[PDB]
Enzyme design. Structure first.
Site, PDB file in Angstrom:
ATOM      1  N   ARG A 100      42.937  43.603  39.103  1.00  0.00           N
ATOM      2  CA  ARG A 100      41.638  43.427  38.804  1.00  0.00           C
ATOM      3  C   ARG A 100      41.138  44.102  37.561  1.00  0.00           C
ATOM      4  O   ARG A 100      40.835  45.357  37.702  1.00  0.00           O
ATOM      5  CB  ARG A 100      40.760  43.657  40.095  1.00  0.00           C
ATOM      6  CG  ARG A 100      39.315  43.179  39.838  1.00  0.00           C
ATOM      7  CD  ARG A 100      38.519  43.555  41.079  1.00  0.00           C
ATOM      8  NE  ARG A 100      38.989  43.087  42.511  1.00  0.00           N
ATOM      9  CZ  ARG A 100      39.657  43.898  43.665  1.00  0.00           C
ATOM     10  NH1 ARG A 100      39.331  45.378  43.413  1.00  0.00           N
ATOM     11  NH2 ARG A 100      39.948  43.633  44.706  1.00  0.00           N
ATOM     12  N   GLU A 122      29.695  48.798  46.029  1.00  0.00           N
ATOM     13  CA  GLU A 122      29.588  47.523  45.500  1.00  0.00           C
ATOM     14  C   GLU A 122      28.741  46.589  46.133  1.00  0.00           C
ATOM     15  O   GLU A 122      28.962  45.161  46.405  1.00  0.00           O
ATOM     16  CB  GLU A 122      31.137  47.003  45.906  1.00  0.00           C
ATOM     17  CG  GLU A 122      32.414  47.559  45.239  1.00  0.00           C
ATOM     18  CD  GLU A 122      33.604  47.199  45.447  1.00  0.00           C
ATOM     19  OE1 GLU A 122      33.816  46.289  46.449  1.00  0.00           O
ATOM     20  OE2 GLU A 122      34.853  47.644  44.996  1.00  0.00           O
ATOM     21  N   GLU A 169      36.082  53.568  40.797  1.00  0.00           N
ATOM     22  CA  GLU A 169      37.189  52.820  41.534  1.00  0.00           C
ATOM     23  C   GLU A 169      37.944  52.232  40.956  1.00  0.00           C
ATOM     24  O   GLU A 169      37.623  51.228  40.021  1.00  0.00           O
ATOM     25  CB  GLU A 169      36.577  52.230  42.809  1.00  0.00           C
ATOM     26  CG  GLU A 169      37.698  51.751  43.942  1.00  0.00           C
ATOM     27  CD  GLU A 169      37.190  51.165  45.094  1.00  0.00           C
ATOM     28  OE1 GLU A 169      36.159  51.440  45.709  1.00  0.00           O
ATOM     29  OE2 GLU A 169      37.780  50.329  45.246  1.00  0.00           O
TER      30      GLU A 169
HETATM   31  O1  LIG Z   1      40.480  46.018  45.923  1.00  0.00           O
HETATM   32  C1  LIG Z   1      40.021  45.998  47.124  1.00  0.00           C
HETATM   33  C2  LIG Z   1      39.126  47.426  47.229  1.00  0.00           C
HETATM   34  N1  LIG Z   1      37.744  47.061  46.484  1.00  0.00           N
HETATM   35  N2  LIG Z   1      36.788  48.187  46.492  1.00  0.00           N
HETATM   36  C3  LIG Z   1      36.479  48.320  47.746  1.00  0.00           C
HETATM   37  C4  LIG Z   1      37.618  48.757  48.422  1.00  0.00           C
HETATM   38  O2  LIG Z   1      37.277  49.205  49.997  1.00  0.00           O
HETATM   39  C5  LIG Z   1      38.831  47.967  48.677  1.00  0.00           C
HETATM   40  O3  LIG Z   1      38.312  46.752  49.341  1.00  0.00           O
END
Ligand SMILES: OC[C@H]1NNC[C@@H](O)[C@H]1O
Ligand SMILES: *[C@@H]1O[C@H](CO)[C@@H](O[C@@H]2O[C@H](CO)[C@@H](O)[C@H](O)[C@H]2NC(C)=O)[C@H](O)[C@H]1NC(C)=O
Ligand SMILES: *[C@@H]1O[C@H](CO)[C@@H](O[C@@H]2O[C@H](CO)[C@@H](O)[C@H](O)[C@H]2NC(C)=O)[C@H](O)[C@H]1NC(C)=O
Ligand SMILES: *[C@@H]1O[C@H](CO)[C@@H](O[C@@H]2O[C@H](CO)[C@@H](O)[C@H](O)[C@H]2NC(C)=O)[C@H](O)[C@H]1NC(C)=O
Ligand SMILES: *[C@@H]1O[C@H](CO)[C@@H](O)[C@H](O)[C@H]1NC(C)=O
Ligand SMILES: [Ca+2]
Length: 641
Positions: free
Chosen positions: A356, A158, A234
């Site tokens: 989300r 991210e 994810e």
């Molecule tokens: O919903 C939080 C997730 N988001 N993507 C990164 C992960 O490590 C989490 O923080």
């Protein structure tokens, strides 16, 4: 009305598997010190084929010593010239998964990086060869020390990607004989990776999979154009109540249907981190009590089973998949050997919200679905049936075999809301079962660790969850009384993912604790400038660790002490002088009861009856003033909850 299932005009996209994430951050922290048999049972529920979640894919963080949502995870290179492939628990987790399922698909991805990689900046792309070298070392080590083949490598979770980096990483992999490792990018949004692949042939050649995060079941035109595998790399991240299970159910189907996504991966694998840390209880199941052995096989485990037990990587989706006229959806898959699996979901809006994104209202009502098998599927006359009703509830129960004696190649179901049906020619399904585990119990109100372990199985003492910095078992042969201690080992701030604190800190215990006494021996390694603390009522951690308040008792090597309400030390309760220097062992005691606290140095009162905010509650903690070496020994805490 009637829904045609056919393969006569060809197949859809190849199915790539369902999986989950351990890491981002320290999500599997509390699992490693589960007693047997429970720890093994838990891993079976996750990874044993034809039993529980039976996951196809396991994705782990490549630890970089930074805070990455619920803690820090140790890197294989803390410093330049340091290499160690036995820190943390992801090596262990991957080996356990692979024991149960040799065909499991393994992926690695960095959230943070060690600071020395930045060469003066908090930026991993200053020296492309160096960052790639670091990452490829991890993959080599997986093979050489643990006998793990890593199947996919990502870029930077991210965070922005660098096209030259991705190219260098490919070049570096190939150079190390890792041509078989595939690259997934960029573990963020669909853009800018998708348009970049259309504009750049050299980039397109080196990226195998486009993995997007939390896509809401949709993709984008550029991604479709690219002709790459598209994954939801994810997703989920919702509390594993029936609600989260609904979310998981709906998106497993509709990520492929609406988004052409041929794999979905849940954050996170198992909730083995304190619940009061960010996104508590957001794993496929719960195991957050190694002291008691209590775990919870939550609904998402069985939601997964409806797909994973009856599909495998390398099966193909049929072209004939879609939505149901009155709400819900269906997918179908075959293996090209005559098998067929049909997965049907009718999750209602109010019972399947993901965090989300949040979907606008959609309606679901009772219906009947007629399915007709055409093409090579018509010859099927028998289907096994598996059913779940989300609450009360009813999980992965096997129903009576359905027969197609007619020669009609057709059958009909009455569907209600919040249900899952799996109809398969496969006979290997099973609702795995172990006897119930011990009841839930709070963290022990009395607790101690002297860290005296010569050959520890894991690199850190149990139940200590690092939220900034990294704490490790330390052996010092040159000392007798303190030969075996706990040591903070970072000497500079990592290339951070989250906003790590200025101070290192590890938390432990029961967040409900409000009255407590914390004691520890501490050793400050840096002359003049060094400092350490112990603390209680620490109310926040993880991604919010900078926000943490509580009662913090600091001593400094310049002959001074401080009592603060916050980890950042902005707010003073008390302060003064103390007979404290570097490189000497002191014993700190901190007592907190109602409105007042006291501190002791070597059993002698240093400060007393200092007024502190109340009511208030939280964990106990240890830590250091900055990213500096320091040691701890003979930790003890007594508390009332
Ligand atoms: O919903 C939080 C997730 N988001 N993507 C990164 C992960 O490590 C989490 O923080
Ligand atoms: C991606 O999936 C979509 C479906 O969401 C496919 O787009 C079309 O979908 C409609 C119904 O929604 C069908 O009637 C069309 O036949 C589909 N298009 C084609 C070309 O068949 C789309 O094909 C998929 N993209 C791929 C597989 O690259
Ligand atoms: C459905 O899948 C099973 C399992 O993959 C198939 O059975 C296997 O068939 C292969 C050859 O086709 C054999 O080498 C394996 O030993 C078989 N394994 C088992 C457990 O039976 C089966 O042929 C497929 N098709 C149908 C109609 O069941
Ligand atoms: C933590 O300690 C405080 C302080 O002693 C406790 O609060 C007191 O409780 C007694 C009896 O329950 C009351 O008579 C006092 O008025 C309370 N003091 C205050 C300032 O509220 C509290 O109950 C303790 N909590 C636990 C869980 O042990
Ligand atoms: C859902 O669908 C049923 C059947 O058409 C309808 O009666 C009901 O009002 C709908 N609910 C909403 C909120 O639109
Ligand atoms: Ca010791």
């Amino acid at each position: 009305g009637a829904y045609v299932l056919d393969d006569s005009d060809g197949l859809g996209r190849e199915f790539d598997g369902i999986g989950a994430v351990s890491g981002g951050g320290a999500t599997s922290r509390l699992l490693v010190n589960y007693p047997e048999p429970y720890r093994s049972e838990i891993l079976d529920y996750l990874f044993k084929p034809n039993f529980g979640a039976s996951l196809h894919i396991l994705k782990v963080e490549i630890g970089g010593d930074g805070q990455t949502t619920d803690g820090t995870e140790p890197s294989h290179m803390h410093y330049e010239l340091d290499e160690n492939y036995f820190r943390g628990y992801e090596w262990w987790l991957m080996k356990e998964a692979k024991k149960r399922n040799p065909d499991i698909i393994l992926m690695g991805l960095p959230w943070s990086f060690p600071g020395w990689l930045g060469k003066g900046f908090s930026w991993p792309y200053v020296n492309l060869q160096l960052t790639a070298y670091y990452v490829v070392r991890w993959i080599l080590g997986a093979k050489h020390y643990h006998d793990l083949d890593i199947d996919y490598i990502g870029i930077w979770n991210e965070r922005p990607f660098d096209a030259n980096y991705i190219k260098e990483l490919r070049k570096m992999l190939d150079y190390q004989g890792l041509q078989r490792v595939r690259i997934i990018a960029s573990d963020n949004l669909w853009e800018p990776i998708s348009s970049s692949l259309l504009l750049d042939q050299e980039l397109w050649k080196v990226v195998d999979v486009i993995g997007a995060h939390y896509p809401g079941t949709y993709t984008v035109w550029n991604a479709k154009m690219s002709g790459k595998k598209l994954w939801s790399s994810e997703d989920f991240s919702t509390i594993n109540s029936n609600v989260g299970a609904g979310c998981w159910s709906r998106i497993l189907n509709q990520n492929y249907i609406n988004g052409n996504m041929t794999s979905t991966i849940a954050w996170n694998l198992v909730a083995s981190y304190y619940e009061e840390l960010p996104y508590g209880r957001s794993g496929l199941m719960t195991a957050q009590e190694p002291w008691s052995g209590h775990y919870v096989v939550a609904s998402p485990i069985w939601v997964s089973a409806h797909t994973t037990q009856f599909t495998q990587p390398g099966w193909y989706y049929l072209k004939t998949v879609g939505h149901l006229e009155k709400g819900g959806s269906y997918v179908a898959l075959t293996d090209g050997l005559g098998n067929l699996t049909i997965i049907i979901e009718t999750m209602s809006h109010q019972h399947s919200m993901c965090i989300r994104p949040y979907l606008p209202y959609y309606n679901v009502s009772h219906q009947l679905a007629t399915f007709t098998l055409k093409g090579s599927l018509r010859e099927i006359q028998e289907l096994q049936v598996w059913y779940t009703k989300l609450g009360q509830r009813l999980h992965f129960k096997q129903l009576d075999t359905l027969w197609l004696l007619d020669g009609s190649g057709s059958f009909t179901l009455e569907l209600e809301e919040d249900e899952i049906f799996t109809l398969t020619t496969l006979t290997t399904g099973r609702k795995g079962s172990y006897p119930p585990p011990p009841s839930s119990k709070p963290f022990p109100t009395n607790y101690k660790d002297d860290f005296n372990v010569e050959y520890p199985l894991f690199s850190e003492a149990p139940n200590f969850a690092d939220q900034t910095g990294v704490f490790e078992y330390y052996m010092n042969n040159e000392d007798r009384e303190h030969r075996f201690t706990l040591r903070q080992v970072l000497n500079q701030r990592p290339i951070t993912w989250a906003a790590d604190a200025s101070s290192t800190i590890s938390v432990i215990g029961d967040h409900h604790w409000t009255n407590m006494t914390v004691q520890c021996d501490v050793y400050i390694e840096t002359p003049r400038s060094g400092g350490v603390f112990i603390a209680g009522r620490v109310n926040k951690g993880g991604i919010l660790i900078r926000s943490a308040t509580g009662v913090f008792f600091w001593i400094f090597a310049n002959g001074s002490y401080r009592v603060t309400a916050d980890l950042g030390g902005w707010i003073t309760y008390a302060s003064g002088h103390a007979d404290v220097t570097a490189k000497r062992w002191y014993t700190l005691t901190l007592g907190i009861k109602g409105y007042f606290a006291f501190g002791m140095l070597n059993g002698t009162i240093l400060w007393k009856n200092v007024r502190v905010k109340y009511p208030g509650h939280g964990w106990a903690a240890i830590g250091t003033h900055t990213f500096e070496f320091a040691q701890f020994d003979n930790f003890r805490v007594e508390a009332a909850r």
